[PDB]
Amino acid sequence: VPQIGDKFASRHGQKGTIGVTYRHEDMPFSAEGIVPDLIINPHAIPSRMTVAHLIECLLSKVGSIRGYEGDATPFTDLTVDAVSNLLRDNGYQSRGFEVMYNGHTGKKLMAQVFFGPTYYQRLRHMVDDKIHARARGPVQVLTRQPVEGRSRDGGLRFGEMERDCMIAHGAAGFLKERLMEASDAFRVHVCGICGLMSVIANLK
Amino acid sequence: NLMGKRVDFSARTVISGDPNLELDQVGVPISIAKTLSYPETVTQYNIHR
Amino acid sequence: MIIPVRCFSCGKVVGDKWDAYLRLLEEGKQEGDALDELKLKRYCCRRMVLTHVDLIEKFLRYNPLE
Amino acid sequence: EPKVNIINAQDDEVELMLSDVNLSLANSLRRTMLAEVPTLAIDLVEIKMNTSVLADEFISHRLGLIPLVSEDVEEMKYSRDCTCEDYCDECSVVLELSARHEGEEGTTDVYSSSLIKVSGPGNLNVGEPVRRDDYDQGILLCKLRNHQELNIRCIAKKGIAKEHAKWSPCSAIAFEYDPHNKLKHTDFWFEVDAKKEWPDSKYATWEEPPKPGEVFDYKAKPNRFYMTVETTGSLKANQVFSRGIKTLQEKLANVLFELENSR
Amino acid sequence: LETDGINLAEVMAVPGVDSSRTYSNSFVEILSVLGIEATRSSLYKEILNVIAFDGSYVNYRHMALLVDVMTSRGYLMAITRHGINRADTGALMRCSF
Amino acid sequence: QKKAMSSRAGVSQVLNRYTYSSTLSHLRRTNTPIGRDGKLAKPRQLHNTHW
Amino acid sequence: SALFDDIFTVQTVDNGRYNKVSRIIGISTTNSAIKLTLDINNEMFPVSQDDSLTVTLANSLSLKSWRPPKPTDKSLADDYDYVMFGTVYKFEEGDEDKIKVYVSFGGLLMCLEGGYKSLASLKQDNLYILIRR
Amino acid sequence: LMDDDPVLFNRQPSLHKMSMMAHRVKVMPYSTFRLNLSVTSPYNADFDGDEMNLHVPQSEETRAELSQLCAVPLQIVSPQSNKPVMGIVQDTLCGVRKMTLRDTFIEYEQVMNMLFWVPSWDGVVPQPAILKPKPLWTGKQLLSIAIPSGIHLQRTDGGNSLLSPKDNGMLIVDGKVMFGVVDKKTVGSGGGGLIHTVMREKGPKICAELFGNIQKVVNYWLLHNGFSIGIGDAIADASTMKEITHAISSAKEQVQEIIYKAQHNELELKPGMTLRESFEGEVSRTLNDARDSAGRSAEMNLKDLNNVKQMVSAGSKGSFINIAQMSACVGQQMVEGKRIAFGFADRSLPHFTKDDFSPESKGFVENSYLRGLTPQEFFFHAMAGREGLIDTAVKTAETGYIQRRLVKALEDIMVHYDGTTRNSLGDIIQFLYGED
Amino acid sequence: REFKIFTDVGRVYRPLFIVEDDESKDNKGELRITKEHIRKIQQGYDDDVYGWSSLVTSGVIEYVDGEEEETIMIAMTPEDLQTRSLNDTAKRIKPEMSTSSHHTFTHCEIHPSMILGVAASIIPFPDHNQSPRNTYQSAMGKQAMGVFLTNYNVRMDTMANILYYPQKPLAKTQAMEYLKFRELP
Amino acid sequence: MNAPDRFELFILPDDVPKLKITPDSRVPNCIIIKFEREDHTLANLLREELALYPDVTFVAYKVEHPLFANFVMRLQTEEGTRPKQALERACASIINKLKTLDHKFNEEWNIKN
RNA sequence: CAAUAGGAGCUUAC
Numbered sequence A: 001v002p003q004i005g006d007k008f009a010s011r012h013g014q015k016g017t018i019g020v021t022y023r024h025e026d027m028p029f030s031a032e033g034i035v036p037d038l039i040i041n042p043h044a045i046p047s048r049m050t051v052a053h054l055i056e057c058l059l060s061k062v063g064s065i066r067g068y069e070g071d072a073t074p075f076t077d078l079t080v081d082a083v084s085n086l087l088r089d090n091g092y093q094s095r096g097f098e099v100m101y102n103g104h105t106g107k108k109l110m111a112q113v114f115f116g117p118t119y120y121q122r123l124r125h126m127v128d129d130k131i132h133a134r135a136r137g138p139v140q141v142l143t144r145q146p147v148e149g150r151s152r153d154g155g156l157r158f159g160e161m162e163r164d165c166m167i168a169h170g171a172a173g174f175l176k177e178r179l180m181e182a183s184d185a186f187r188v189h190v191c192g193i194c195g196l197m198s199v200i201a202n203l204k
Numbered sequence B: 001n002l003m004g005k006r007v008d009f010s011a012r013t014v015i016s017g018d019p020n021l022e023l024d025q026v027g028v029p030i031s032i033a034k035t036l037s038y039p040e041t042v043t044q045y046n047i048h049r
Numbered sequence C: 001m002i003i004p005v006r007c008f009s010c011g012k013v014v015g016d017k018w019d020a021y022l023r024l025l026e027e028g029k030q031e032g033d034a035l036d037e038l039k040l041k042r043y044c045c046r047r048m049v050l051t052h053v054d055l056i057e058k059f060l061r062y063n064p065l066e
Numbered sequence D: 001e002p003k004v005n006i007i008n009a010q011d012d013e014v015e016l017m018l019s020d021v022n023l024s025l026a027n028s029l030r031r032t033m034l035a036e037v038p039t040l041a042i043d044l045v046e047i048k049m050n051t052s053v054l055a056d057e058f059i060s061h062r063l064g065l066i067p068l069v070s071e072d073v074e075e076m077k078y079s080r081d082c083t084c085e086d087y088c089d090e091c092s093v094v095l096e097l098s099a100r101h102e103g104e105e106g107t108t109d110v111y112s113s114s115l116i117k118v119s120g121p122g123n124l125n126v127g128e129p130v131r132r133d134d135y136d137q138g139i140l141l142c143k144l145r146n147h148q149e150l151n152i153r154c155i156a157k158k159g160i161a162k163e164h165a166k167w168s169p170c171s172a173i174a175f176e177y178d179p180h181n182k183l184k185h186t187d188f189w190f191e192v193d194a195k196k197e198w199p200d201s202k203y204a205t206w207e208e209p210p211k212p213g214e215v216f217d218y219k220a221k222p223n224r225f226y227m228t229v230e231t232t233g234s235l236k237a238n239q240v241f242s243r244g245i246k247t248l249q250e251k252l253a254n255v256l257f258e259l260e261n262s263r
Numbered sequence E: 001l002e003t004d005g006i007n008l009a010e011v012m013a014v015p016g017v018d019s020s021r022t023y024s025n026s027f028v029e030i031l032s033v034l035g036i037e038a039t040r041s042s043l044y045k046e047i048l049n050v051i052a053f054d055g056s057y058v059n060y061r062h063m064a065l066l067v068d069v070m071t072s073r074g075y076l077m078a079i080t081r082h083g084i085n086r087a088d089t090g091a092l093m094r095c096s097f
Numbered sequence F: 001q002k003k004a005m006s007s008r009a010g011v012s013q014v015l016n017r018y019t020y021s022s023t024l025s026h027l028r029r030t031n032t033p034i035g036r037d038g039k040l041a042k043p044r045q046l047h048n049t050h051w
Numbered sequence G: 001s002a003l004f005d006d007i008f009t010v011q012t013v014d015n016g017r018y019n020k021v022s023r024i025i026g027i028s029t030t031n032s033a034i035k036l037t038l039d040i041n042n043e044m045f046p047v048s049q050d051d052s053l054t055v056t057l058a059n060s061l062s063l064k065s066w067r068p069p070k071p072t073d074k075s076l077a078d079d080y081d082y083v084m085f086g087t088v089y090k091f092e093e094g095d096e097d098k099i100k101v102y103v104s105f106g107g108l109l110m111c112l113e114g115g116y117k118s119l120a121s122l123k124q125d126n127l128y129i130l131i132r133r
Numbered sequence H: 001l002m003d004d005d006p007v008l009f010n011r012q013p014s015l016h017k018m019s020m021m022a023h024r025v026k027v028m029p030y031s032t033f034r035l036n037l038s039v040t041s042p043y044n045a046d047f048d049g050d051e052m053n054l055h056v057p058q059s060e061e062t063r064a065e066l067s068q069l070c071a072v073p074l075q076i077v078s079p080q081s082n083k084p085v086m087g088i089v090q091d092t093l094c095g096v097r098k099m100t101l102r103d104t105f106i107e108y109e110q111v112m113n114m115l116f117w118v119p120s121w122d123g124v125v126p127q128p129a130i131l132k133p134k135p136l137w138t139g140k141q142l143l144s145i146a147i148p149s150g151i152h153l154q155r156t157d158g159g160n161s162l163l164s165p166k167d168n169g170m171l172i173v174d175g176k177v178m179f180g181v182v183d184k185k186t187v188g189s190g191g192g193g194l195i196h197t198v199m200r201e202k203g204p205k206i207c208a209e210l211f212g213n214i215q216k217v218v219n220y221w222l223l224h225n226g227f228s229i230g231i232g233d234a235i236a237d238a239s240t241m242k243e244i245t246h247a248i249s250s251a252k253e254q255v256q257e258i259i260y261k262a263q264h265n266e267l268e269l270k271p272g273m274t275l276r277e278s279f280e281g282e283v284s285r286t287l288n289d290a291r292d293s294a295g296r297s298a299e300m301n302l303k304d305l306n307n308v309k310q311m312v313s314a315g316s317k318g319s320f321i322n323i324a325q326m327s328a329c330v331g332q333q334m335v336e337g338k339r340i341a342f343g344f345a346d347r348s349l350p351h352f353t354k355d356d357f358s359p360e361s362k363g364f365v366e367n368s369y370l371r372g373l374t375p376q377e378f379f380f381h382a383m384a385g386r387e388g389l390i391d392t393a394v395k396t397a398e399t400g401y402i403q404r405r406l407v408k409a410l411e412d413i414m415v416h417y418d419g420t421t422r423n424s425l426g427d428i429i430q431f432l433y434g435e436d
Numbered sequence I: 001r002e003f004k005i006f007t008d009v010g011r012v013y014r015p016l017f018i019v020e021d022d023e024s025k026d027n028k029g030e031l032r033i034t035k036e037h038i039r040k041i042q043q044g045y046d047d048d049v050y051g052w053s054s055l056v057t058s059g060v061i062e063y064v065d066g067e068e069e070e071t072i073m074i075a076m077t078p079e080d081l082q083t084r085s086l087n088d089t090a091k092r093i094k095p096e097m098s099t100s101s102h103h104t105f106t107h108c109e110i111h112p113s114m115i116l117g118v119a120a121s122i123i124p125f126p127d128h129n130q131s132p133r134n135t136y137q138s139a140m141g142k143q144a145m146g147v148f149l150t151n152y153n154v155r156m157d158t159m160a161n162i163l164y165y166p167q168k169p170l171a172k173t174q175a176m177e178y179l180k181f182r183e184l185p
Numbered sequence J: 001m002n003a004p005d006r007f008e009l010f011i012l013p014d015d016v017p018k019l020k021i022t023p024d025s026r027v028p029n030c031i032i033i034k035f036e037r038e039d040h041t042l043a044n045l046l047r048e049e050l051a052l053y054p055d056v057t058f059v060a061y062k063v064e065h066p067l068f069a070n071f072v073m074r075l076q077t078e079e080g081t082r083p084k085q086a087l088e089r090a091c092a093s094i095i096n097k098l099k100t101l102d103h104k105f106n107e108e109w110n111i112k113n
Numbered sequence K: 001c002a003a004u005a006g007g008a009g010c011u012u013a014c
């Protein structure tokens, strides 16, 4: 079942994840009581220039009102003006704006809201397939370091650039603690004369 | 394995935006908050807790 | 798959209208008029019935394995 | 001082104008009718034999989404406040569905009318799936071929739409006020002229348009609200409206009770 | 004047040229002709040009440090294994790179 | 099998059955075995003759 | 109980940039070279060209937490039609007898020229402006 | 893991020290990580699939190190360009621009909600800018409530007077806005703005709380105001369409004249540049200026209620080129610095004739996105976008290699207690750090 | 001064309409395909099975690879075959094409939207998007939950995702009739 | 896997009070009320009812996080009046208005038959 | 109180 953090997209490169969910009464409504399934942010249109997204919302609104499927084949003689003429002939603001009310207060919104149906997709990337945490777990046989893999209950790589950032921060103790006590820390005995790890130790 | 290595006590998941969090706050899922841990030495100011 | 009981957006019951919609479509009435007679006035409710694809007919064709 | 003027009134929907009330009151009423009016819906499904092509939780979701008659649901108790163990007769309604296709041609459709009420807190008029007419076939639930069978024991319980949409008595509560924008609460986007490019409200003829000589009024608040409640047949429109009002009243009484008994 | 190609020593001598202001965009030539401090100045000028081309502004001290590391030995030390690993630092640092 | 090195890899792939269009696209895919050892951006470019 | 009483004749009104805000210019009818530029809310106090405005500047309305006014109490603003509150942010004791005062009424700006002997008492922290007609 | 625990939070790639910062924990349901929206800039993150890593310090020394060196408030100003890196972004910027317009007024009840929404409000209701006939607050007052007291900022934009007819510039006295729309130039990440001033005067904690105060106030106001964008916000009226098409036709005539001059051998070459390269440079100049002029026409046609114009003017998303391409002209596409090459024999596409140097043949897109691209323009724009994607995919490896080599070259260099800048061998690199 | 005929295997090719180019008949300069051919295709037989191959063998559609494409002049739409005499501020300006006095077309696109592939064909109005967004959708549409097959219940795969209530799109492309996106959304 | 239950919106625990009052010491005669398990429906109704009384100087509410079902309300009153009594007065007034509204709706519905 | 390795392929975010 969809939840916060699941990834959705429309057919125009407009991908995004669910940030929050609101119930029926909390969502903004038009005067006919229609409420949206989905509220996306206006700041994704201008710099991305996905005009087809807005055109397709308008065409879908007209098609659902008149009970057919809009033809959105590329390189045809359809125009936004004709779609707006149809929409206005159906008794709606020709540019797809509607007067909507605030769900929390019922007061009208000072701005009008671009509103209509759009075909969205449920992508395979779900948060529940990605969320991973590890306190302690299996280690590798050879290196005795945390294993690799979410499925294997592995650990995350604290690579070289993370070390550079910790060095820039001047956090020496944190770096030593990441690389020793959060990973393959070991104890060895050295010879005070030859300095080789050739010391035979019987601790008991 | 020496310049970089895999470490315990780490987590990873998708990030989301929250207008109602402070600048230096991060929202942590309950499941991760329970999977990860911090070792806290017992003292005479935190023994009841 | 099979017609949803409710309209996703508002919650009107559309699950009891799929057969009537098909019967309206047999005698030649176009989709908008059929949706009008079933008294689906909001375009959310209308696209609920207008875009349904009935896949249960295809799933039912494979012989029951019991 | 509050006033009601019903404009259209049938069993499923009521269209009414509300006046001399604050906008917060009207919006609270809309929200209450959408979210907090209790109904009855199937909250527990028990599969005995399901050899249909549809999956078990698919069918369970569809059965939970079936409207049931909830006229007497207010004399009933929430299943979390009853002393009983696994459902008793007074805080739950038990339904049975048995369907089966015999023969090797044709498809047998399983409809919501095939649900049969077995137990329930009689003689309360709750539990039955809602039929539009005497000849209604109800909601489509599944389809069956040769030797495929469906044997289900559903439990119905009392709940509200906050927990899950299947308990919502309402589909869409149309709601608007001030058709002529006299209060200037909106600010119309336009290309050439905002009066030509915007369609009139369906209650435009219910209020006098502003005169050209008129100046803006800074004393006027919203005072007339046009709203159209629709139902799913589980409750009637007057019942939805009256129980939304009563639910709001009891929420305020709960607040008052906590305040007084906090002294 | 701007030119293609480089011959700093002979152009600096030609009469009519401001011999105290001729500059080259190849700082190896600067080192061979003008010394190591002029090489540092030229190196900073080139790095500032590359960064500030697009309107980016990097604070002075970072590029100053980068050019001081590259000219500290008296000659140009490239940022490569042939430059970094020919220092006198410990073996473990050089091997780690 | 004993010459896995110096042999082309990825010539056969597991058919993608996640959705129908993904299957239809996987059945019509093409691969130029130039390899990633080399930063020549020219063969990666959409070309006029691709029309 | 007022700091600067005067009558002004409105010269120009550029509605222009905004919809609820207009900038007006007016010279005093009794003492020219006193210029007044003022931003005003159109919907609360509409003003047309050549109209005559009685403009007052005061340091108080009496005769720190804002609360809505009751009907039963009285203040100086009772005799006016348009009252605004502002902050003096520039007092230009400039050329021979050009004195400019700058008041910001929550982003609605005002400038007032004139001789020093008229605007000397206009050197305060906050100023009320009151208007009739 | 509990509330307020310091944890190191990190997104790859970690290009600079502010890509990995220490955050305070707040436990929540719904398995994603939650971030305040102003810190998404130093991480270079957005919310369309990204994942970030969280590292938990396992001792008190590392807790103290994180909280006193890596904490988010301490990284607001960067040493890279001695300017702030965290700003107000992406809806709070647009909303604060709309809220601090001169003709924005708020009634008492909405004012009351906004004041209660401010975490640092001192419980004093500011006097309204208007007292009669109806108490009205301006948006500038409500935003000034957010700013701490003791802050003074002054900016001049194109020589504006202290009476600011355009509501440009900026004046802040004791934390109160006297005039000036609040936009990217005031609450952005640029140097000298409000964030830098509050950081330098009040410290990192107050500057961190400023982000939250402004975000909350502006978000509430925009929730109850509303802001949208539609297909109509990209549409210019008929007269502007006539102007735009006239400008494009004039530029096409100019290009045709340049072509005639080049073909009858009368074009004037430039130093260090060939006749063919001179012809191409002049044509590219002409077409770039054509697109810029058409965009200027479209921008002047846009009303103040146009939503694209509001977003651009706030500086929160989009720029003038975006408006130009959506409403007036997409313009010329470049592949490898040149126009669209003759990939076929002497032509770009097999729908053109041989040796046709007109703007349409070699990658000029006359339409806008609103109007729709032709198949030829679509293919040329596809080539250009593919070039961009290849560049983004391919240069990042060279850049990462360069940055790794720089880090290894400079990794052992530290400022010492005597002021000198020395490496691990003790050799002097600079006798005083930064020479200052 | 060369003539190259190729019968190699592995060449990629695409069909085009054949514009009559013989400069000797009144039928010169317009498409050889007419309304009798469409009537035959709808009928399903010639008037003394008529499918695509009959068009190919009747000389009204032919195949061209990239090399042969070098030598041809393709009209984008059947209207481009004749110069029109307009002034529509809404419809996009079909390019002027003024340099050339008289066009001699040899081929016409069947439909310009056919340049796209399977994944790009789902996009509605792809000519109103900047190309990187079309590329991102071409990548992302392959990760979209639907109904991969109708026999998913008798198959045993490592992983499978089926949407509960697939819906056909309200804004649809002509190609999706051939991609079955409305049959298995 | 981290989703809380959809019934914690309305089911009051036994250890969680419905209502909790603390005073705001910064300004005189002001109180802060946290309503647990409520939302905009009660909050906006109460706020716009209380905002129209002469003796109420400050009233406001917020829902600090949408993922948590509570709101907090700040209410100040004049010297003589107590914010609590004004809160009961507003509640009673809305109850009476709803009762009158219900009576008139029922009579109108009967007349419509 | 104990859950292999090595490869190839397809993908995610920059």
Ligand SMILES: [Mg+2]
Binding pocket: H045, H046, H047, H048, H049, H050, K013
């Ligand atoms: Mg991202």
Ligand SMILES: [Zn+2]
Binding pocket: A191, A192, A193, A194, A195, A196, A198
């Ligand atoms: Zn030894």
Ligand SMILES: [Zn+2]
Binding pocket: C007, C008, C009, C010, C011, C012, C042, C043, C044, C045, C046
């Ligand atoms: Zn609906």
Ligand SMILES: [Zn+2]
Binding pocket: D079, D082, D083, D084, D085, D087, D088, D089, D090, D091, D092
């Ligand atoms: Zn019971």
